[PDB]
Each structure stands twice: as structure tokens, then as C-alpha cells.
Amino acid sequence: GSHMKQIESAKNQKVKDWKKLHTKKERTKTNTFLIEGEHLVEEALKSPGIVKEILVKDETRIPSDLETGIQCYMLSEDAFSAVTETETPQQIAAVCHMPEEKLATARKVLLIDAVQDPGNLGTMIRTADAAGLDAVVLGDGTADAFNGKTLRSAQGSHFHIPVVRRNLPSYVDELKAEGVKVYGTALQNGAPYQEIPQSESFALIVGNEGAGVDAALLEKTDLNLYVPLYGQAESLNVAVAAAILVYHLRG
Amino acid sequence: HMKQIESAKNQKVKDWKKLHTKKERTKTNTFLIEGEHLVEEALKSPGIVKEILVKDETRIPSDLETGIQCYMLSEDAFSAVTETETPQQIAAVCHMPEEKLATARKVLLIDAVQDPGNLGTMIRTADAAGLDAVVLGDGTADAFNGKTLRSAQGSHFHIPVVRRNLPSYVDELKAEGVKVYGTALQNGAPYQEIPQSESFALIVGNEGAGVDAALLEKTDLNLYVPLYGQAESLNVAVAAAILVYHLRG
């Protein structure tokens, strides 16, 4: 049989184009992004229509039973490195389409106010995915969701739920206009989460570890809730706290 | 009185360095923590800190417990001792926690979790929820490694973190009237379905295998966090946190 397509050189226009996925401009242009790692790729392959191209240095790494519309390329080490740009050695990468957005219709959403840690951000995305939320909305100041650490941390949830960027204050206004109840994560003027009833439509705002949700944003909330601290711990990890709240509201 | 240590080859420096491995910790029944936050917390629990290590005399706390021995080290010696690449101005050697458990009515049982980050998160969560203790089953990763200690943010000095054989320990808990919950789908309902009880013991397992099957047979009831969306799974610590707070009330 004929061999798979090969790309020997880092100067190849496909390679340069792939390398560009590290820029915000090319991701915005294409609504695609680059992923690395066997499990991420596997997760992507589970989601219909997500994977566009697959890159490997070795044919043994090619996943079994691939859909026919997927183009696979075998790359040289130089070419593979050029694309991935990762110290930690990788054997497979892929280019993926972002999931269908549907923001206007979203009625169960997680709003993230300026979370900087990739680990926390990834955990939040994964949790939103697990709880079956409509979308994850990132406020100004929040870290890029498509950075390698976040992608890795999210373990494939990027393939399932839309993760978009909006101005939180404006988005809240829009949500309120549509009748979605808005909850803020805060102690001040907040109630312990267990006292709160479940809601069919909701938007939960979560914030960073130090400052927390912005004060001007908290004023726009219908209600505020929190996870009570019973022991000596100063605080709960924000993603962990977010998970408890999201799942509670969801019931 | 305070002592100064100049050489990296000094026996104490070698022994402090040895604290980063589990065998030394087990042998000496002590462990090493780095950074102001961890030391501050450790200091708040009376009798825990044995030695204080600093490079600057002014970093030594103003009112330390009398039994604490202070050491001012050189930059080279300090660097030798510490595992964090990031710059630190203080380190401490602490006594390992007492294994005996005075009270065990609300506890978290961890079955073979290996990730230090997860373990740390679980410890921190247990502290926040006000549980009596965190019990580590045979096979679980060491709670006193640097990663877990950092991850827990000082929680180790707020809650007893001990080791027990889960199967035998569960029997003991049942004998005492403590209800035992298993985190699992089989015969389990969504956690929302489960009512609170005065006392509880939640068993959480690792991601690959979950709670051991033999262990699951012992439980009174099983519960889980449903996966409504397409995510493969929830992070074990995150799931544990949801269940712990649920049972806590």
C-alpha cells in the first residue's frame, strides 16, 4: 500500500502554518487549536468532527480505527519539534476544531473572573463539562484556555464544551435580561450553599484565590453563596469550591 | 542557643537533605517543610516544630517555643537542604504526627491514591470540612513528600493524617457504629439522594481502579457524583470534595 504523507522539513508551509496555532491570531482565524499527548488525542477522536489532522513521528502511534476524513502526517523530529514547541517529549499531536459555540441559547454557565492558574482553570473547565453545563465564559484577565497547561489540565473537556471570552459585567446584564439567575461566589452577603435551592437555569461566577470575584461584579448578582469553612483551613481551593457549587445548583 | 552551619558537607545538612526521602522520615519520625507559610502554620500547632533553619537571624520568629533549636545556615548550606527551586528564607523540621486516633467519627479514607497533588487537595479539603482525620490506606502515596505538603497548604498541622489498613480499619469503624460510604456507581445513588448521618467514613479510591472491590463489599452504602456531560471523569479530589461536603452538611 501507499505510505502516509510525510513532512521532512520545518520550512514546509503546513509546518509553519501548524506552528502558527501557538498564536492567538491563527486560532481565531481557523477556530482550531493544537493538542499533544496520546490521551488528549484519544479524547478528541471520541468527539465527532473534532479532529482535523494527526501528527506522529512513528506509525505505531497512529490510533486504530480512524475516521477517513482525518488527514495523518508523519513528521521528522525536527518538523515535529517545530510544531509542538514542548520540552517534555511528545509522540503524537493533533489539530482540532473547537466545539459549536451556541452562546445565545446557553442557560447553565460558569463565569470565571480572572483566574490565572492553568491548573485551576483546567479543573474548572473539566468540572463544567462533567456537570453538563452549556458553556464556560472567561472574563477579562483570565488565563488563556488554549495554553498547553490548561489543555492538559482539562483532559479533553475543551472538545466538549465551549470556552469563550466575554466581558463579565456585560454578559451578566445579558444573562439577567434572558431570565437566567446569576449567582456569585462570596461570603459577604452570601449564604451557605446547602441552604440554596436548585435552579434549572443558572450562571455561577467564580474568582481567583486572592481577591475573589470583583466587587462591582458581585453587586450585579441575584444571590451570593459559599462553601462553609468548618476547620482551621484558611480557604478551599477555588476550583474545588467551584465544583461543589456548580454540582449543587445542577442537582 | 543558636548554632551556625557553614558547610554543605556538615552532617546536619546531610541529614536534613536525607529528610526528602521516605526512609529517613520513617527512621527519624520527622519531616522537613520549607517556606514561611508552612512554617507559620506549623508553629501554631504547639510542640510540632523541632528545628528552625534560616539564613538570616532576623527571620527567626520573635517568640518561639523554648525547646526549638535554631540554625543559621550559609547560602550554600541552605540551598543543599531545600528541594524547592524557588527562593525561600525559612525551613523547619517537624515531628511526625501521632498515629493513634483519639476520635474518629467523621473521617476520610483514601484508597491507593498516588498523585501527590490529589492527596494534598484531599487533606486540605478534609481540614476545611472539619473532619476528624484523614486515613491513608496501604498503597497510598506518602503524605509527607514535598509536593503533598505544598499542595495541602499547611493542613497537615490542622488534621490528623494517619495510616491504617483499610479493610481492618473499616471493620473497626463499623464496630463503633460509624456508617461507611463507598464512592462508586455499583448499588450507589447520586449523592443528592443520600441523607446526612451524624457520623461517616467516606472511602475514596484512585482514578484507575476506584475503591477496591473487596473494600466496596464492606460499605454500608455507596454514592457517586454523576457525569451529566461528556467528560471522561471528574478529578478524584474534586469528586471527593463534593461528597465530603455533602456528608458533612
Final residue in a domain of this structure, among B46, B80, B98 = B98
Give me the phi and psi of B183, to 5 degrees please: -85, 105
Distance CA(A52)–CA(A33), nearest Å, equals 10
DSSP chain A: -PPPEEE--TTSHHHHHHHGGGSHHHHHHHTEEEEESHHHHHHHHHSTT-EEEEEESSGGGSPTT--TT-EEEEE-HHHHHHHH--SS--SEEEEEEPPP--TTT--EEEEEES---HHHHHHHHHHHHHTT-SEEEEPTTPPPTTSHHHHHHHTTGGGTS-EEE--HHHHHHHHHHTT-EEEEE-STT-EEGGGSPP-SSEEEEEE-SSS-S-HHHHTT-SEEEE----SS-S---HHHHHHHHHHHHH-
B120, B178: one domain:
yes
Contact A230 B130 (CB under 8 A): yes
- Method for this entry: X-ray
Final residue in a domain of this structure, among B73, B98, B123 = B98
- What are A124's three cell numbers? 474548572
Confirm or reject contact between B133 and chain A (CB < 8 A).
no
Distance CA(A10)–CA(A63), nearest Å, equals 24
Minimum Cα–Cα distance from A43: chain B residue: B232
**B57 CA: distance to closest CA in chain A (Å):** 28
Count of C-beta atoms within a 10 Å radius of residue B21: 12
Minimum Cα–Cα distance from A250: chain B residue: B228
Distance CA(A83)–CA(A151), nearest Å, equals 16
Distance CA(B63)–CA(B59), nearest Å, equals 12
3-state secondary structure of B236: helix
Final residue in a domain of this structure, among A82, A100, A118 = A100
Handedness of CA B19, B22, B27, B32 (dihedral sign): positive
B132, B194: one domain:
yes
A168, A233: one domain:
yes
A137, A53: one domain:
no
Distance CA(B90)–CA(B78), nearest Å, equals 9
Q: Which of A144, A138, A147 is nearest to A166 (CA)?
A: A138
Q: Which of A178, A58, A56, A44 is nearest to A109 (CA)?
A: A178
**A83 CA: distance to closest CA in chain B (Å):** 27
Q: Where are the alpha helices (DSSP H) in chain B?
A: 11-18, 22-28, 36-44, 75-81, 116-128, 146-152, 166-175, 213-218, 236-248
DSSP state at residue B206: B
**β-pairing verdict for B188-190 and B133-136:** unpaired
Query: How many Cα atoms are found within 13 Å in the side-chain-facing hemisphere of B187?
Result: 10
Q: For residue B117, give every residue at least 6 positions away whose Cβ sits within 8 Å of its Cβ, in sequence order, or none.
A: B147, B148, B151, B237
B140, B62: one domain:
no
3-state DSSP of B182-202: EECCCCEEEHHHCCCCCCEEE
Best residue in B44, B242, B243 for a mutation probing chain A (most A CBs within 10 Å): B242
DSSP B15-28: HHHHTTSHHHHHHH
Confirm or reject contact between B240 and chain A (CB < 8 A).
no
Instruction: With beta carbons less than 8 A apart as the criterion, state whether A81 and A19 touch.
Output: no
Beta bridge partners of A72: A54
Q: What range does the domain containing A195 cover?
A: 104-251
B158, B94: one domain:
no
Distance CA(B182)–CA(B205), nearest Å, equals 9
3-state secondary structure of B222: strand
Distance CA(A8)–CA(B27), nearest Å, equals 55
B42, B30: one domain:
yes
A183, A109: one domain:
yes
Contact A230 B121 (CB under 8 A): no
Confirm or reject contact between B227 and chain A (CB < 8 A).
yes
Chain length of chain B = 249
Distance CA(B53)–CA(B70), nearest Å, equals 6
Q: Which residue has the cell 482535523?
A: A52
Q: Which residue has the cell 468532527?
A: A49
A114, A83: one domain:
no
Confirm or reject contact between B151 and chain A (CB < 8 A).
no
Cα angle at B170 between B167 and B173, to 5 degrees? Answer: 155
Contact B228 A250 (CB under 8 A): yes
- Give the residues after which the backbone of chain A is interrupted, taking a C-to-next-N distance over 2.5 angstroms as a break: none
CA dist list (Å): A122 to A28, A163, B210: 20, 11, 22
- What are B59's three cell numbers? 527571620
Q: For residue B15, give every residue at least 6 positions away whose Cβ sits within 8 Å of its Cβ, in sequence order, or none.
A: B24
Confirm or reject contact between A179 and chain B (CB < 8 A).
no
B131, B233, B242: residue with CB nearest A244: B242
**B77 CA: distance to closest CA in chain A (Å):** 30
Distance CA(A50)–CA(A99), nearest Å, equals 7
A157, A159, A231: residue with CB nearest B129: A231
Our measurement of the distance from residue B204's CA atom to the centroid of its chain's CA atoms, rounded to an integer in Å, reads: 15
3-state secondary structure of B41: helix
Q: Which residue has the cell 503533598?
A: B148
- Using a 10 angstrom Cβ sphere, with 0-12 exposed, 13-18 middle and 19 or more buried, the burial of residue A113 is buried
B10, B131: one domain:
no
Q: Give residue A106's region: left, alpha or beta (phi > 0; psi -120 to 50).
A: beta
- What are A80's three cell numbers? 515535529
Instruction: With beta carbons less than 8 A apart as the criterion, state whether A242 and A219 touch.
Output: no
**B158 CA: distance to closest CA in chain A (Å):** 6
- What are A245's three cell numbers? 457549587
Confirm or reject contact between A215 and chain B (CB < 8 A).
no
Our measurement of the distance from residue A173's CA atom to the centroid of its chain's CA atoms, rounded to an integer in Å, reads: 23
A128, A249: one domain:
yes
Q: Which residue has the cell 470565571?
A: A112
Q: To which H or E segment does residue B181 belong? A: strand B180-183
CA dist list (Å): A179 to A44, B131, B182, B187: 34, 39, 39, 38
**A244 CA: distance to closest CA in chain B (Å):** 5
Q: Which of A236, A231, A230, A182 is nearest to A209 (CA)?
A: A236
Best residue in B232, B233, B243, B247 for a mutation probing chain A (most A CBs within 10 Å): B232
Query: How many Cα atoms are found within 13 Å in the side-chain-facing hemisphere of B58?
Result: 0
Residue type, position B73, single letter: L
Q: How many CB pairs under 8 A join A and B?
A: 90
Our count of domains for chain A comes to 2
Beta bridge partners of B51: B69, B93
Beta bridge partners of A53: A71, A95
Distance CA(A248)–CA(A229), nearest Å, equals 17
B130, B227, B238: residue with CB nearest A240: B238
B131, B29: one domain:
no
Rg (CA), chain A: 20
